[PDB]
Amino acid sequence: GSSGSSGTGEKPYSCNVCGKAFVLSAHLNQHLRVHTQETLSGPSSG
Ligand SMILES: [Zn+2]
């Protein structure tokens, strides 16, 4: 169990916050929200 999940052609968009990926930009933005949101859970992006 050394290698992760085998795949081809890594998505251009990636969530550099928690650890996600997306094919398009709009998809990534929708996600980033969960991070760029005012809450008392953890460190925000801004
Ligand atoms: Zn994320």
Side-chain angles (χ1 to χ4, degrees):
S2 191
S3 183
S5 64
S6 276
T8 307
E10 184 188 307
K11 270 69 90 275
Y13 305 91
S14 310
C15 168
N16 64 82
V17 179
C18 67
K20 202 153 202 69
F22 312 76
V23 180
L24 310 175
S25 189
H27 294 159
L28 171 66
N29 271 326
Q30 286 291 69
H31 179 70
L32 295 170
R33 290 190 77 156
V34 305
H35 307 314
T36 180
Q37 195 178 61
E38 283 284 35
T39 183
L40 210 296
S41 171
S44 68
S45 36

